[PDB]
């Protein structure tokens, strides 16, 4: 009933921290509100699908921490199929293996250039200290996207891309924020890897194993069905309180739930206003994740690796990967219904999306078989109580530089982790682990077992999944823009 350090929440994060404090031999205790551990990663396990993930799914080069961690728990990885052509759906026509207009294409590549080149000036660790932090944060992704682009086409492309990447609509998010986000993932090419093929990987057996495996290492030290609702940090013995009125006592809390639900807690004494805001004012993105299963892998039969970037207003699925199991079994297709459409289509009955979707995929892969699915799993994170959304927190304009600077500041004995508070790959599981270990080492450092300078450990690049530093073609760097080519006439 009494402990060294509590961790509130049992996602990849609060768990990464629990294991690490354990490593050192500190009494840990992890209260998670759900029946399960795993949070935004969640592995529905049923005889129709064997395993299938419904949240955190894809790992990739430079995401060493999670790769490291998962490997150690005894979890293997595998490559996501992209051998065959990539479908492009627009104007109601299909294009295989695709990113045709020049001045568009200028606008295209110059956009994505200006995004990276623009990002160079952003301090991953304190993005609100970029040079133009005040001007970009006041701006919106759309405004900027608009400024950068002259073609619709590419301006459009920009859009789902914001959508695809932070499950949110452009007009909603900071300019600065997006920029810093695509940055701290290592910038366009990392974030949206694979143009005529590349590297996404899934954990074999579903990534919910990462969390589960740890819950073993801890065993009874993880209490489930335990929402935390008060954290009276007053006297030298912290008193945490839960929903069911089960108290606990400790010397270090660690908040590991995300910032909205953090916001939901009663801390006595109050978190200081500066942050108390920042917590209220971050929202979570919008996504439905959608498994279509098939008997036959048909889309392969047709010469599509089973992946389509679909850019048409009514289509429900925005983006698609293949989700066939590693060993050829259970052919499938994994889509994303997201952002604004995710709010639009979540009001619907399961069996009505399932149709809508199928009839899209139908007219895209051009194969009637699409009309005849065999199973359909979906998960709607809009409608998660203990997550608010997927993938992450996101930043509405001006918030970043107004309160942003807190995000992760330790208050009292209540340190803060969770993929929000990450620095590298923040928003993804990789970032989850980053935060947990960090928070842990803080508590740890406060106990003495770790140094100050010791609290931010670098991350040896997995010898297993080795990231390759990018490459930018001549013309990539040296073609004009529309903005430009005019001053060339002009
Ligand atoms: C959902 C999702 C999705 C759908 C997707 C995705 C995701 C998700 N992600 C994200 C992740 O997951 C995150 O990051 C994490 O996981 C988070 O974690 P954490 O930190 O730990 O947090 P959480 O989990 O939530 O936990 C927390 C906890 O706590 C608790 N609570 C609450 N409240 C409370 C509590 N306790 C006590 N008390 C109280 N009061 C709860 O229970 C919980 O549990 C991800 N990630 C990664 O890494 N990966 C992936 O994949 C993922 N996914 C994403 C996505 C992405 N995307 C889509 C983009 C990229 C890729 O894409 C692509 C590419 C290519 C192509 Cl072709 C296509 C596509 Cl699409």
Swiss-Prot record:
The EC number(s) this enzyme carries: 1.4.3.21, 1.4.3.4
Record PTM S-8alpha-FAD cysteine, positions in chain: 390
Impact after mutating residue 390 to S: Complete loss of activity
GO MF term set: flavin adenine dinucleotide binding; monoamine oxidase activity; primary methylamine oxidase activity
Cofactor: FAD
Site annotation Important for catalytic activity: residues: 358
Single GO BP term: positive regulation of signal transduction
Compartments, record wording: Mitochondrion outer membrane
GO cellular component, one term: mitochondrial outer membrane
Pfam families: Amino_oxidase (PF01593)
Phenotype when changing residue 250 to F: Found in a family with Brunner syndrome-like behavioral disturbances; likely pathogenic; reduced activity
List of residues that carry Phosphoserine: 367
Record topology, Cytoplasmic segments: 1-481
Oligomeric and partner information: Monomer, homo- or heterodimer (containing two subunits of similar size). Each subunit contains a covalently bound flavin. Enzymatically active as monomer.
Family from the record: Belongs to the flavin monoamine oxidase family.
Official protein name in the record: Amine oxidase [flavin-containing] A
UniProt source species: Homo sapiens
Chain's gene name: MAOA
